[PDB]
Symmetry: D2
Subunit: 323 residues, 4 copies
């Protein structure tokens, strides 16, 4: 066994728990830390308003959660591993887990440029046994990276810009009000607004695909759904192309690809909730705009920003064993 401590039993920690359980394949969790009663953590694991009720026996004791007759010890220690709090988002900060005997830490978020950022099935081949603190990137990184990686190999991305139409998340407010950081848009009611939101996924995409350093920028629009997101990429490419050419080329790279999938059934956001891909290419939205020989190419991939990302993070976790 490699024994996992999940720090932060939030949307991503609980979902990582669910994924590792359902892989029952042999990876296993053995303990958890949050700011919360074991009772409420077990209740949250069992009942999920996005992902439905866990088909397992779930209960709590005074210091643990219990699932299917196994005990998982729980702590309430605010100062510190699958690091999922959002409070240890750097190598400097994620220092305590090393500082008490982990071989490694995988942070569930971007965590700077002085460590490696991994998108499974794009660049997980750079991991070495020396790698102790590793970023699994953002949810948007795991969706955008394979699209841009394959689109670039095929056609040469000169420059690109991204807009993700993204589900609301726990950083946002239910109703308008003061918000940590003071941001004017973070402050606003998430369920009844389209809310522009800054993202680093395009700008920092060089950490995953070095040759795309400096070549992409983007942002998000946070919209009134609980989960399920889509990334639009508009690029100037080296090659002149048509939409059918683009689709056929990208599609090839989805074949058997558990990280970067494909759907041509004219799906909508709900349909990706509970999917296991980091990114789902949608050829039905591909558009090539041309006049003379000046050309814009729009491509799109969907993603369960919660569970798709979580599945990517678990794959990267499982790969730590091979090192």
């Amino acid at each position: 066994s490699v024994k996992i401590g999940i720090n932060g039993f939030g949307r991503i920690g609980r979902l990582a728990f669910r994924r590792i359980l359902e892989l029952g394949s042999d990876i296993e969790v053995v303990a958890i830390n949050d700011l919360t009663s074991p009772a409420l953590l077990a209740h949250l694991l069992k009942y999920d308003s996005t992902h439905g009720t866990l088909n397992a026996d779930v209960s709590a004791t005074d210091d643990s959660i219990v699932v299917n007759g196994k005990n998982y010890r729980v702590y309430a220690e605010p100062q510190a591993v699958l690091e999922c709090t959002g409070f240890y988002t750097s190598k400097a900060k994620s220092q305590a887990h090393l500082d008490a005997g982990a071989k490694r830490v995988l942070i569930s978020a971007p965590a700077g440029s002085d460590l490696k950022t991994i998108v499974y099935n794009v660049n997980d081949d750079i991991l070495t046994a020396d790698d102790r603190i590793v970023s699994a990137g953002s949810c948007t990184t795991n969706c955008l990276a394979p699209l841009a990686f394959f689109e670039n190999k095929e056609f040469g991305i000169k420059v690109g810009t991204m807009t993700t139409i993204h589900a609301y998340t726990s950083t946002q407010m239910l109703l308008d009000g003061p918000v940590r950081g003071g941001n004017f848009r973070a402050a606003r009611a998430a369920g009844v607004n389209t809310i522009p939101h800054s993202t680093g996924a395009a700008k920092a995409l060089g950490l995953v695909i070095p040759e795309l350093n400096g070549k992409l920028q983007g942002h998000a629009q946070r919209v009134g759904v609980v989960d399920g997101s889509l990334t639009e990429l508009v690029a100037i490419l080296d090659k002149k192309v048509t939409a059918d050419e683009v689709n056929a080329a990208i599609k090839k790279h989805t074949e058997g690809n558990e990280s970067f999938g494909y759907n041509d059934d004219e799906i909508v956001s709900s349909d990706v909730i509970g999917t296991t891909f980091g990114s789902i290419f949608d050829p039905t939205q591909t558009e090539v705009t041309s006049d003379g020989d000046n050309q814009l190419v729009k491509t799109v991939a969907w993603y369960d920003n919660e569970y798709g990302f979580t599945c990517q993070m678990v794959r990267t976790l499982l790969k730590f064993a091979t090192l």
Copy 2:
């Protein structure tokens, strides 16, 4: 001669109280807001005052400085002092009276901190225990005196239920009754499922995509406002997926046998000219009450009498803008209280 107000907590209720006082113009000239305390930048407080996802954009010139917000050229000093006893607004700004709207000072002992800071009087924007007076304007505001120092404006649900229950009891006699309020979500709830202050299993759940049962004390505690109904009511809420606008259903055993039209006529007469307890028979829905100025809006279209022989239940319903309708009630009480 104006009583100078310090608003503690420039949240949904504190900002709307500001909007209400402003729009009242000369009708609110007995008071004057001079200072605001919260946990944030003046820049964000001004921005939240100006742009409101529920109630729309304020038709006023709003800006911020490094220590104040400015509205139509009037300056309102801003503090960010989490401990109320340390807010220096009595000395610095002349504050006489604190409008307490944080949610964190809802008791006599807690709001003592404002008196320790030098305030003369405090009106709390919530229930705040039984050792102080709880006022629903136009039901029991007559119990206020010049000697009160810390008073509760009650809850949103109290301000909706009270006049309905008051007048229904006066006309017919409520023997026992139960309430269900179908209530907009509020800022105590969660956007997505997760740990929540208090550890409550339902309060932890995503508010925009669930009907969520929620405890309320308005019915059980209604004797604080209407002594004769002490012990006669209980109830609860269902928090539902709208930002604002709520309704209270009351099911009662009455001392009189009735029809819906009889109950409607008898209650309606108490809404006539009543700025606190209104009446709407247009078959409205929740969003229609957003921005209204009543604590309670009786809806005769939902009255139901259920009988089999001499066994009877009677269901009555009143809408409320839990934000602005309550706020308007609290400002009425504020105007009365401040000037005793």
Copy 3:
């Protein structure tokens, strides 16, 4: 096997299909107003109940599931659907909302169908069955039967057992109900012209008339005349709850009422039990017609005047559908 024609592949007809399919150890044809391509698509991808774990496609005239073919028609008049000669239809599961009577569902009989089970209230001149309350009143003689409404299937076992244990003198219901297809996304004119049905469903709490309490005597004769109620339609896509407030014959406490109702949920696939402080999402996809929630029980007393509030959750779509499939199974094998 008895061969089912599903008329109306809407929310309920598609879910009936999914339920029949998941049950494993049935359906031969389908009618609607639309292409086989779109019906296949809607059976596969569902915004409420998720993606069907089956291989689904469409031919020019039929849907395909796990290599099995189901014929599709687009015939507005039930009389005119040729599924009895073409497909062997012996039994119509009537799910359109437009044949909601014995008079109207007669058209299936004229089309050659042996029986009809209507997925809705359908008058008082036929039987209305809530499975595990009154399904013993079915016989071989019956041809057109009502599976009730979604609200009837929630309210009925709750009222039934409460009445059996305590005696209901009178009661009123409020169901806090998911929006449905009869409502609008934005405000505008609606069929029937009702001022509330006209209003945007996702951003309002909307009072709505219901007949389930008033008509409950069709299911539970001794409660004829003793119940009324209504709905509040709220901004969720599925998942509902029914509150009942009643005057009882017996004096009670909440713990007493909870224990007495709970015993009738033991092993009961129609009327279940949940005391984990659930919320509406949690019942989406559940297979009960009704889920008693003892956490919401309340007994209000002053002197000898007493009111009792009890509540049951329901997946108004799938819970109802599972009820209907139970009744189908019984009704078709008689």
Copy 4:
């Protein structure tokens, strides 16, 4: 001496047009004198008075069996399915028709109004290429006295047009693509089900999905701005709000620019512009509900991405897809009076 308007189709757009013209009437100058719609006046009056998006009208509204009454004034409601039979020119003094039914969306169809004696018709939608498509404050100067049937374009056209027009004037757009992140509309479904046209996305529940949707506003923009014919494409993502939308434009420009340069250049065209506004307060979609612009430039989202010689520029404008479009149409009705 007032311009008198007949509204054909008292839907969301017709009702908002009534509300706009009422409020201008408070006191430049235009009044509604009659309506044609097949719904009962009682329901129409109810929907004029209460609205889940735009709030309650601050007026006394009631109904008779053939009219709506507002503030003591009677507004006849005709119920003619064929527009050539609406009698409101000789009965009510109708000068111009605002055609908002969705069923007269062509020059040849709306001829019916002219046959009933209307001087001019404005259609509340795209209506083909054999009549003029006018975005007020972009190309309304092309109207002449001979223009009797005119299209307002779409709501999207009214947002995109001024952004594209001014951006092209300042910098030259070589090619561009649009994504509008758009509030759900009446054509969509509350819950998944069969849908007119059979489209797989149109079929889906609108309140709980982000739904891709085809648009024509970018492709057809040459009708408004001829030099952009053939240069733009785009689509929409329909999202879970009742109203309030934004249009993103990504373009290759003739000039090398910075973000600040782009912002300043576009900003100067918003100044005093009642049709194409400006907001740099970091607003969100609800903040535009009830605003009167067809388009609201938001410099906070401008982005310029550049690697060596290749450059992309993203610019964004917000819009009340209902009321901003409505206010554009009323501007064009007022312009009709000067022809």
